Structures are given as C-alpha cells and as structure tokens.
Symmetry: D3
C-alpha cells in the first residue's frame, strides 16, 4: 500500500517520523499486510496554499 | 489533514472500515489534530496496474 | 496547470462537463494562463471509500 | 469535493488566494455542492520539474 | 521512487505491462536508483472525465 | 498521459531533465501515444518525509 498524507507545515522531524510509523502500523494491521510493503509519503502545505470553503486556511 | 491510500483490490468492507478509522486516529494523535479534521480517501488498484521493479504485481 | 478533482460518484454528465469548463476558466483567469494549457482530471469515489473523522462518508 | 491544483511557481500570495476562491466557487456551482464542503490544495512546481513532450517547461 | 501514470482507458494489458517496465527502467537509469526500488501505479480515465482547455477529451 | 514522479531530493537539474525526457519517451513508445501529449511532473521528498515499513528512509 502507498499512502500520501497532506498536512500543514510546522511540525518537527520527530513528529513527522511518529506520523509515518503510526500510520504505517495502522495500514499494516488493518489490511493484514506486511509492514515492509507499506510506503508513506508526507507532503506539507503552507496555510496560504490550502482552501476550505473558498477561504485560505491561514484566515 | 488528507490521506490518499492506494491499496490492492480485494479487501473486505470490514478491513477498509478499520483502515479508515485506524489511519485517521493515527494521524490525529501524531499531529495533535482534531479527529474531525482528518479526511481519508481509499483508491483500489488491480495487480495488473501496479509495478514493482518494472514487473507486474500480478506475477 | 493540472487540476485533479476528487468527487463523490453520482453526478450527471452535464454537471461534470460544467465542472471541467468552469474550473478551467477559473484557473486560467486567476493565473493569467492560456486556457488551452489547463488540464482537468475528475476522479469519482464511492462514499464507502471516503472517511471523515474516521467514519465512512456513507454513514455520516 | 477535494481539488489538487498543480501550478508553476512565481505567483503572489494574493493571486493564489484568488485561485483558491474562484476554483472553489466554480466547483460549488458546477456540482450544486455546498461551498463549505469544497477543499483546495495548491502545489507549486519549478519549471525544471515539469515536462511537456519530454522537454522542460523552462 | 513512485510513479503514478494517468492514462486514457482502452489500452491492452500488454501495452500497460510495457508501460510499467519501460517507465521503471527510465526512472532507474535517470536517477541511478536500483530498479527494485521503483514502484509504478497506473490509473485509467474515461475521456468524459478529462478536460483540455475546458472541453471534454471525448469531443 | 500525465505522470507524477515522487523522488528523493538531491539530484541535479540535469538528472531531473534526463528523468523527464526518458520517462516521457518510455510512455510514448509503450502506448504508441504522441510524445507531445505526454506531461510529467516531479515532486521531491526529504528522506525524513518518506517511510518504508514505518521507518524513515533517512
């Protein structure tokens, strides 16, 4: 499985490593898939590059 | 946060429901983000549409 | 520019055609990019394949 | 609805805000979906990271 | 490396297998990355779900 | 066709240009599709943003 996770910028490397580990484990146990087969990629966004209801996340 | 999870076809409804719940919870606790803000989209693939090392997953 | 638009299944052909046109026009005028350069791809999802708050969209 | 828009780098914050608003409104009226349900994420690319016909956009 | 390739529906199984192999090889030599590390996922689209210049690919 | 290629950061502009050209040509010959119709977008990732087996690539 391959998971792309889109998150706001601003977290530490440690928090992102935790995110990757916990998500990978959740995918593996949910699907009964080998942990080694799970790939995760994180993509960060500035709040000025994200919209909800047409309004910037930054407001 | 938004997670797009690419998985092989053939998982049960129950496993997919678990996937959505467990991944959402993992994202929420890892990022200290409200669970209600976490969105997940599952996309399924035939093994004939996936490659590893240039070879079909189906072989 | 390339837009990938993820929507729930169940829209009409007419609404999808409108979506493509109106989004393309919005991208073109917002960015001052030639309309001919704007590409849109629509991807549909069953509500059973979408989660909000850890719950299936088909439930909430 | 969730829209991911891939654009070249170099626009101002104001132009990108306009992009987000106008695209969101277009999605909402095209689909008769509540505006509040529409999410947009912008991803920028350097012209050396985009290819057309095998050739760099730059 | 992970490649997602978006193509129109209607290609043969053989062409898709070739696509996976040839793209994977191109990635491997371009990046000097081991072929075994390259993953490809193909996604097909109906021409009614693709727009060019605001017009459906199907017209 | 549109290809999105996710790669680790650290390659030169020249290597990325080669990637774009060689991938585009591979798509074109594999599908018998005109080279001019093939678009490629590259996205780079830090090794701290990539997981294999739940562990950081770095």
């Amino acid at each position: 499985p391959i998971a792309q996770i889109h998150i706001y910028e601003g977290r530490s490397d440690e928090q992102k490593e935790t995110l990757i580990r916990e998500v990978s484990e959740a995918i593996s146990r949910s699907l009964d898939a080998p942990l080694t087969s799970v790939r995760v990629i994180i993509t960060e966004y500035a709040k000025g590059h994200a919209g909800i209801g047409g309004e910037l996340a930054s407001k």
